[PDB]
């Protein structure tokens, strides 16, 4: 019948953009009924901002309600729990989805950056790889930059956080780069955004194609 | 009611161990009925080997049939399709799950191996990272070796295949290693097993902690 999902603010949104938001999605396979309410609240009792709202009846007959709530970074850091409560249809119990900052010890990531040896054929392209590890909570964002301008997201792929043997998480990120970029200027930064990185929630490493 | 899954032979099993097997799993949430048949066949008509079989009624009331079929590597390479057919309960249509070698062009992986700079605290540990890329079909196995003996699986983690921009796949693998290992002998191999690697379906790169 009804499924509901709520996302986490990305670290990039908490600490860089600094306008973080969370998104509550409801998927109702049989909208046989009237309105499906969906309501935000905070565990503390404090008020929430207004949220966007959007409904689509989908071609297969499913109804799809999305809602987006802006949250405070400071509130998020102090422990707020944000809650999306789904209400009405043939639901005895309401559904409720929630998100809060992860428990446990904190620990800034270590970043390492590596370049690929020239491969026959490629010549005009090179591969950069960034290993980011030992960070605690696994929440993390990753940017690559060049001429102190952040590259587009889709230029790189980053893997999902997995647990290291022992404690903390790691993550790999990969960016192909072109001769026109590296001769332009032979420096690329791999930057992680993480709540425990401290002055300002980031750690970065520079890497170069040649020596 | 009834779900069914069938796995793919790992490349490590096709090309190294050389006794590859596939596993057909049925999960039936309401075993209200009698026997659930599960039957192997090949798309070509040719006979199959005998398979292991195992049933467990689970505590939550689910019934769980697993079956394991040995297959030929040469048969697999020539295009066989293996099929697990699930039969009986309140199923009008039978279910059928299948597995076959992936379509399209082939291309051996490129392996690159990197070591981590000393990190304060660690000292007695170092991190190795292997980038494996541009391979086609995404099916791949990864071993790390030391003193020409393959390390245990759980010593390393490897990521899921993702598509590079353009063509082919990549994969990262990570292995922590200890001072006792690298002073013992400072060479570790990262080995990929892949159908297109040709003499013998493998490509490897050596890496060292110091220079």
């Amino acid at each position: 019948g009804v499924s509901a999902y709520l996302s986490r603010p990305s670290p990039f949104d908490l600490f860089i953009r600094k306008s973080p938001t969370i998104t509550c999605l409801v998927v109702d396979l049989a909208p046989s009924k009237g309105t499906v309410n969906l309501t935000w609240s905070r565990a503390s009792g404090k008020p929430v901002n207004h949220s966007t709202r959007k409904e689509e009846k989908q071609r297969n007959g499913t109804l799809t309600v999305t809602s987006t709530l802006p949250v405070g970074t400071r509130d998020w850091i102090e422990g707020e729990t944000y809650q999306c409560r789904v209400t009405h249809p043939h639901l005895p119990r309401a559904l409720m989805r929630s998100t809060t900052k992860t428990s446990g010890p904190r620990a800034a990531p270590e970043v390492y950056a590596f370049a690929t040896p020239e491969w026959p054929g490629s010549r005009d392209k090179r591969t950069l790889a960034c290993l980011i590890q030992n960070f605690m909570p696994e929440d993390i964002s990753v940017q690559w930059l060049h001429n102190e301008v952040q590259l587009p997201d889709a230029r790189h792929s980053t893997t999902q956080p997995r647990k290291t043997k022992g404690s903390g998480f790691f993550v790999f990120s990969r960016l192909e780069v072109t001769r026109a970029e590296w001769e332009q200027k032979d420096e690329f930064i791999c930057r992680a955004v993480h709540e425990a990185a401290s002055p300002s929630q980031t750690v970065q490493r520079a890497v170069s194609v040649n020596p | 009611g009834v779900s069914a899954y069938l796995s793919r032979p790992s490349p490590f099993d096709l090309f190294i161990r050389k006794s590859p097997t596939i596993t057909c799993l049925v999960v039936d949430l309401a075993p209200s009925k009698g026997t659930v048949n599960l039957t192997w066949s090949r798309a070509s008509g040719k006979p199959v080997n005998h398979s292991t079989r195992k049933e467990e009624k689970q505590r939550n009331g689910t019934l769980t049939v697993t079956s394991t079929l040995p297959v030929g590597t040469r048969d697999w390479i020539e295009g066989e399709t293996y099929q697990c057919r699930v039969t009986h309960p309140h199923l009008p249509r039978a279910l059928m799950r299948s597995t076959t070698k992936t379509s399209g062009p082939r291309a051996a992986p490129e392996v690159y191996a990197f070591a981590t700079p000393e990190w304060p605290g660690s000292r007695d540990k170092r991190t190795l990272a292997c980038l494996i890329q541009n391979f086609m079909p995404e099916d791949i196995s990864v071993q790390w070796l030391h003193n020409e003996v393959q390390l245990p699986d759980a010593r390393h983690s490897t990521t899921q295949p993702r598509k590079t921009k353009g063509s082919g796949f990549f994969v990262f693998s990570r292995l922590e290693v200890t001072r006792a290992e690298w002073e013992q002998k400072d060479e570790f191999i990262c080995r990929a097993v892949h159908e297109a690697a040709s003499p013998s379906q493998t490509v490897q790169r050596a890496v060292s902690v110091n220079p």
Partner: antibody, heavy 121, light 111 residues
């Protein structure tokens, strides 16, 4: 493979609060109640309470009312237990457990490894 | 309500030993299922019996459960060194809405 992964050991001063975590893999976190069970060193199992992840509702045995708070972070597949006003006697291993049933009373099938909580001056 | 078990019980390998679990008419006596758990030193409990007499996937058949009136009983035939563990029963207790564990029994294997 279904797994209840519990957090590491915690060491607290009397009067403190600790939040230990039970992270779920292998089914839909929000489908089934999670139960929490306490075990003081050398002593028997005690059933503390249960939470329903789909909606946040909880229930506690009398003894733990007030000083245990069960929560669930659905966005991250994580059932939390929060112990407060910690006392020496609150030193125990705390387990989370479950059964993929719904509508069934006991016989927990899947168990975390336990989180030890040690309270000392 | 407490579900009470004898604090301890004794073995001698290959022999058959029983553990009992006694409640009242508001739990076991009330038609509610009994279950059993086994705990080895330093490990989490494992479920051995559920719904009175059922074994979960992988438990040897030498373990059996029965439920009499207000009591239920675990029986281990062919006692083995490895059976040396703590055992707890559990049932539902409607006056409290809880599902308490029994006081627990320490199995000791003789010899």
């Amino acid at each position: 493979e279904v797994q209840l992964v519990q957090s590491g050991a915690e060491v607290k001063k009397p009067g403190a609060t600790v939040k230990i975590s039970c992270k779920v893999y292998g089914y839909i976190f929000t489908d089934y109640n999670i139960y929490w069970v306490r075990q003081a060193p050398g002593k028997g199992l005690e059933w503390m309470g249960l939470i329903d992840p789909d909606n946040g509702e909880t229930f506690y045995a009398e003894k733990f009312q007030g000083r245990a708070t069960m929560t669930a972070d659905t966005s991250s597949d994580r059932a939390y237990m929060e112990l407060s006003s910690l006392r020496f006697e609150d030193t125990a291993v705390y387990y989370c457990a479950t059964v993929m049933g719904k509508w069934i009373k006991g016989g927990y099938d899947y168990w975390g490894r336990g989180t030890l909580v040690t309270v000392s001056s | 309500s407490v579900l009470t078990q004898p604090p301890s019980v004794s073995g001698a390998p290959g022999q058959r030993v029983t553990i009992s679990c006694t409640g009242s008419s508001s739990n076991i006596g009330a038609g509610y299922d009994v279950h059993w758990y086994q705990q080895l030193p330093g490990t989490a409990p494992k479920l051995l019996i559920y719904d009175n007499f059922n074994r979960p996937s992988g438990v040897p058949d030498r373990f059996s459960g029965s439920k009499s009136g207000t009591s239920a009983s675990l029986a281990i035939t062919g006692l083995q060194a490895e059976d040396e563990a703590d055992y707890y029963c559990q049932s539902y207790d409607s006056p409290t809405l809880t599902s308490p564990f029994g006081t627990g029994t320490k199995l000791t294997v003789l010899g």
